[PDB]
Design a protein around this ligand. Structure first.
Ligand SMILES: CC(=O)SCCNC(=O)CCNC(=O)[C@@H](O)C(C)(C)COP(=O)(O)OP(=O)(O)OC[C@H]1O[C@@H](n2cnc3c(N)ncnc32)[C@H](O)[C@@H]1OP(=O)(O)O
Ligand SMILES: CC(=O)SCCNC(=O)CCNC(=O)[C@@H](O)C(C)(C)COP(=O)(O)OP(=O)(O)OC[C@H]1O[C@@H](n2cnc3c(N)ncnc32)[C@H](O)[C@@H]1OP(=O)(O)O
Ligand SMILES: CC(=O)SCCNC(=O)CCNC(=O)[C@@H](O)C(C)(C)COP(=O)(O)OP(=O)(O)OC[C@H]1O[C@@H](n2cnc3c(N)ncnc32)[C@H](O)[C@@H]1OP(=O)(O)O
Ligand SMILES: CC(=O)SCCNC(=O)CCNC(=O)[C@@H](O)C(C)(C)COP(=O)(O)OP(=O)(O)OC[C@H]1O[C@@H](n2cnc3c(N)ncnc32)[C@H](O)[C@@H]1OP(=O)(O)O
Lengths: 424, 424, 424, 424
């Protein structure tokens, strides 16, 4: 399209991303090519948009491309890399050349860029018999100092090197280090810039959007490298990071396409919290009753009787935690096979505003879908916009299933009626 | 001595140094030896004492120790270094290894250390026919960003590398770069840590304390390397830096001995501002008269007559600028050859508090010294402590030269009498 | 030694002390002598080093030296002082002269010094029949206002006087007031400057370092004055203050020697928290098992069997709280009587980072010492530096007790071996 | 009146006083009586109203009431006080008792009150032969530290004591010290709380409102004590203080009545800047012409001709500085003896907004008054509210002097007409 249409398309994601923190793990290959000026520029822009940036790069591949040309062969283990003194020394060289060239590339074509001693490392030690020598993992990250630079508006640049209190230096694994830094900062987003296009499924298809479970279950059959991504992306989510993303850093302007279109072009991973939602039974009736009574009493929910719940308990879903129930929601069916109706949606006032509402609606929508329903009605007297704001369009008596149009007239509430269309 | 005596000796310099900025130019040799853990520790301490630190290191010697072992020979010019692409690339390697090892050394045996893209460079260009290729000099230093890190309490670490807006990188001369950064920050002190003990004089003697003139005149006969120090130290002073210092970074704990003892152990350089102080003549009498009248009229200065100034004008010194006079001061002599007396010391109220007072006293003391006087009296009614605070001890009528003891009794002012001893 | 050696010796304590708060209770005798210029200077320095200072002085002795010369005799009670209106009035005089002279002494030989109405007092009331009249104790300290002055870098000076909301003034006991102010500020250190050298033991020996228990048990046989110190020093520790210290304010530069040498020269008191550490029994095995399993499973701890723990349960120590166990650690012995080995050291992840690790190592070291062991080995695969950092030096297969060298080869883990020497 | 009417009366002065600084010099007698609780309360309130308070008290009278009861007699000189060591020591006692009791009184019947070492003193030295011993005057006030406490909302309390850098203490004269502190802070108001009702005139009348000149000329015949007030109040004004005030601190709630009523009850002093305003002559015509032309050209001022100014130059006043003119203003008279008219009022755009406008109107009003005019008209097309806002009420053609009503109709401008009444 036109410039304007594209700019307006990006606007909502610009809104979201603003004043948010984003930790980028970057493959060290991308710091050498012509792939460098391009992505320095894209990072520049990210800065220009009020995004707080932390950047970490790896060095494994450079190290190896020096081992190879040297006669030496690299040993990895549990996926990590045995780093001797000489190659630890070469990684400090590499970090100096990559940071300086990223800087030059960042300056010409003035964004404040900063670096410091934020990471303290300790040696991974020995694994399965094998000494990881100078392979480190992060022991203690200085979260305050970093916030402080990011507060100032500075982009933070981190090499894959931590220091120990014995005055030693340890090579860090970029992929797990970026995950750990993101967890410390509670970053809204962790972005891994790799050399592939996201993460594939069994047969060839690039996985757009994945839950942590689904990612988890891809890994059973996936190549070891992408196995390590997912495991680090899973641990990050579990640690607090709202969203992790895998892209191809080599594919021109991929970074921008991911962040600022509904599409994206790589893979995106997110963890739903635990939300036991189960089909109700006669045991739950006093609980639903207690929850729902005061809302009836206030005119928010249609009067009911215990008889109705006894005889209708199979259209009810409940949301529980540690036994106790915090929500419920019903689905009514009708003579018309295309229609459903979500009713008696409620959540404890004390567990309100945490997404329980949304999870119950989702659950009933999947329940409705799974039985052929393509039009979900909601009839509400004081909560219409909650539904309006979640895909429900305004409707009318005459659009309702015949019998419901009946009960609507004779119940007297003059509630607002809404429908949402559900597809294949 | 004991710990306590040493700690109390350091206290006054600790007072001075606190919250003050200090830019250290460091020879890159000192970043490799066992000379590294030692001086990381001393810099640590400096930090611990509330000193704002900027650190810059050179790379010339490392570069050369790579040219030599390569077959290549290094060309310098007007004292600077022709840096080709390959050696520019090696200086980025060097900076990564030196910053990482200084860090490790700084961490073990936690001080906040920071680095960023504060320098923009431009190529020195061509000199006397010779292309300096990638030899840069600083074009624009980001003074705000630096203050901001130093305000936070961070030690700033700078490599000898600036970036251009064409996305190129230029090797910087440490010695002149540290001078330029210090000038930008208006640092109170610029410290060059070298491999010699300060700067020698003609015959062998280490020059403790030098004015910029005196340094300037040593350089006519001095080795080119120390010639370049002095020229950069001179330009720094002229630019605002209150004090520049040359030490031996290799000599264990030299840094600490310089800053925190009256002694020091290297050389220290400072510029007096311009202070035309000349022997008065009959032309100045109305000016002195005008200056001095209102103070007489107030009881601060002994009454006088124009006759006295006419006939006594040769014991008077005046301080001038752009013709106009801002101060004067007399020296009286007596039958006793060991005695003098500073009198009629005065400075315009509008040029007060800038050191003019002090310069006039100094000048009369040199005048007194040069004629064999070893005891300078001052007789003041409302300004005793100005003299007390500058080496004058309390005295009495009976200590005065006989005739002055006479005039003292019969002038009636009951001014306080002070003396200062002056030696060989 | 030399200046440099002394300065480097002080550096680590300078590091510690920086930005830390220190409340000094000062005997009012020390505010009169030649002991005043000396310790104003030392306090000056303390300021110069970034230490936040609160200062409180007493007046009892001055009051008494006025009662005596007056005919009057002073009555104390439960160790405190009955202050009538007239002597309350004289303590306000004393505070004005002592604050003014401390100031003058502080200014000449410029540190920001501040004072205000931070203390509200209430009357101690009546004790054992006796009216303490104008003897107050602190009712409410304005902790915010004080932090605020200390944040500004000001030294706070407090007289032993609080005000009541009835508009009355109450004399405060310096020793207990300094303890209360320190508790409010949660100061890292409380320092009492007295006229003796610390606190003695039964027979003559100056007690260098004491736990609160040990101090507590000295007091059963100690002179009443030092009894009151310890009781106030104990309550301070219990209240949060990390460390309280008793010195001789009269002994020149004692203050500096305490803070900045390993030695010190007075007495120092600290409270260990509660840390039930007991010899394990067959009941603890499932708990240790549960703790230790997942670490085995991860390769951090040597595989074991329940049989081993059943038959080896006597070399195990466990750390408990409210029944539940949070840590364990074993000591192995060998045919060589000089050798031991700490093994199976572990702490719950949820109670990690609170010093439990350290307490278990300490406990096993005392256990090893008490049975003649002078060389403690530790064999760790992924936790060597935890031991390196706590007095363990690197070792080798050949240094191990013969049998352990055996098991080491044939267990296959290629863990790192460390030893620590333990003396008499 | 009623509470409401009084509160509304105070409101406008509350507006003015808010966030403004007020330095109070307080006679030390007022710190002892029942006059203490009363004025602590009134100062309290002042604080409660957002007024930044600095308070300084004297001690002379207490000192003397100790000299008298001792046999000793006090010597003053040029109005100041010879303070020996013993009485310097007693003033430190006095300051401790007065600050403590003011505090108690301030607390009961919680306002933050602060004190520190803001003053450095130097000895007045010797005057007219006489040694002022420990009589000091302020050498350097720490203006930053004080602003900083006042910024925090703290009331600052200062004793009449400064310290020297020789570690000595000097008694300060409250009256001149408060003037010097006020000048440093550029305080909006300096308030001297004495034991009389303001400053009298020749015959008995309390002087309400005085210019610095008028105060100056009262002093030729005034008692020495009030002579010293005026001289210190004059120097303060000249130094920047907008307004100094003399009250009776003993008269209950005088402080409040001064600040918050149009009345006041003591005396108030203010300095007009220099404002050469002189009757114009034929020399000024080109200058007025140049000033006034562009405003005519814009429709702001009635067209004129040079002829009119030539023949009418005697009704013109001009405001000059260094020769150059910055303003002018005319007064027209009419057949009606009660009428005047201010016209052709103008000020250079470059000297606008500094009160020149106001000074010209004032000058013409005095000119009009002095010739019997009781109704000043102003006819303006684009500047009515400037006049509305300065005592002019709206009027109409028919209210104008007959001839002016004529010229008004036939000039065509439909300017707005305003009048101001002027009385005896
Ligand atoms: C068809 C029907 O069943 S009609 C009956 C609907 N149920 C009721 O009205 C019961 C009373 N209300 C509730 O119980 C509400 O908590 C629910 C069920 C609507 C939503 O529960 P939650 O767990 O709080 O839902 P969820 O957390 O997903 O959404 C919370 C958001 O809904 C918004 N919301 C809550 N009530 C309303 C409302 N009455 N109108 C508009 N928005 C609302 C909240 O403000 C909150 O806003 P936010 O996104 O800006 O923070
Ligand atoms: C023996 C004799 O001639 S007696 C006559 C001495 N002359 C007079 O008293 C004339 C009146 N005073 C002056 O003219 C003063 O300016 C002088 C001549 C004493 C000093 O002139 P400056 O150029 O201001 O001297 P300089 O700048 O070196 O020192 C200024 C410092 O002196 C301090 N100083 C100035 N006057 C005095 C004083 N009367 N007492 C104590 N210290 C003083 C100022 O406070 C300033 O203090 P700082 O170091 O804290 O900022
Ligand atoms: C010989 C042997 O038994 S080998 C087996 C050692 N045990 C294990 O490795 C079990 C896994 N690790 C643990 O259980 C760790 O908690 C322990 C036992 C080593 C220490 O427990 P804690 O109660 O946390 O000890 P403590 O609180 O005294 O010390 C905590 C500090 O140790 C540091 N530390 C923890 N693990 C390590 C490690 N693997 N390497 C280096 N330092 C470490 C922590 O970072 C923390 O650092 P800090 O001082 O900068 O805050
Ligand atoms: C009857 C007659 O002579 S009509 C002709 C009046 N003269 C003109 O209009 C000439 C154009 N204006 C001027 O020359 C204006 O500067 C003057 C003469 C009105 C005032 O001159 P100043 O020296 O600026 O007067 P002064 O400093 O006492 O007052 C300045 C204030 O007047 C206010 N003021 C200035 N012009 C106007 C205006 N046109 N209307 C309302 N208020 C105004 C300014 O905003 C300023 O406001 P402040 O008090 O909020 O800061």
């Amino acid at each position: 399209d036109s410039f304007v249409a594209h700019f307006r398309e990006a606007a909502p994601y610009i809104r979201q991303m603003r004043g948010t923190t984003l930790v980028a793990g970057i493959d060290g290959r991308l710091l050498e090519g012509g792939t460098l000026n391009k992505l320095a520029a894209d990072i520049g822009l990210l800065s220009q948009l009020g995004i707080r940036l932390v950047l970490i790069h790896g060095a494994y591949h450079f190290l190896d491309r020096l081992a190879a040309a040297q006669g030496r062969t690299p040993h990895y283990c549990r996926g990590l890399r045995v780093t001797d003194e000489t190659s630890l020394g070469q990684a400090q060289q590499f970090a100096g050349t990559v940071r300086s060239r990223f800087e030059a590339a960042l300056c010409g074509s003035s964004v404040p860029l900063v670096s410091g001693n934020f990471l303290t490392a300790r040696p991974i030690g020995v694994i399965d018999g094998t000494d990881m020598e100078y392979a480190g993992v992060i022991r203690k990250t200085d979260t305050a100092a970093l916030r402080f630079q990011l507060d100032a508006g500075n982009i933070v640049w981190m090499p894959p090197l931590g220091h120990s209190y014995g005055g030693k230096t340890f090579n860090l694994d970029m992929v797990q280090a970026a995950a750990s830094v993101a967890v410390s900062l509670q970053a809204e987003k962790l972005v891994y810039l790799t050399l592939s296009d996201g993460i594939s499924r069994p047969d060839g298809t690039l996985a757009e959007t994945l839950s942590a479970q689904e990612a988890q279950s891809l890994a059973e059959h996936a190549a070891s490298e992408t196995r390590r991504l997912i495991s680090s992306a899973v641990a990050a989510l579990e640690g607090g990071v709202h969203r992790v993303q895998i892209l191809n850093g080599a594919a021109d302007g991929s970074l921008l396409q991911e962040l600022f279109t509904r599409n994206g072009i790589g893979t995106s991973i997110a963890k739903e919290a635990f939300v036991s939602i189960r089909q109700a039974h006669s045991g739950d009736i006093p609980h639903i009753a207690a929850l729902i009574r005061p809302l009836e009493e206030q005119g928010i929910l249609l009067h009911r009787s215990r008889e109705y719940l006894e005889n209708h308990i199979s259209e009810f879903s409940i949301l529980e935690h540690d036994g106790n129930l915090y929500g419920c929601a019903a689905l009514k069916t009708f003579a018309e096979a295309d229609c459903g109706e979500i009713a008696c949606l409620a959540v404890s006032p004390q567990a309100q505003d945490g997404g329980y509402g949304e999870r119950l609606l989702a659950h009933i929508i999947d329940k409705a879908r799974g039985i052929g329903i393509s039009r979900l009605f909601a009839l509400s007297t004081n909560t219409g916009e909650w539904f309006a704001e979640r895909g429900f369009q305004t409707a009318s008596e005459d659009e309702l299933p015949e019998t419901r149009r009946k009960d609507y007239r004779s119940n007297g509430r003059n509630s607002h009626i809404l429908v949402r269309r559900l597809h294949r």
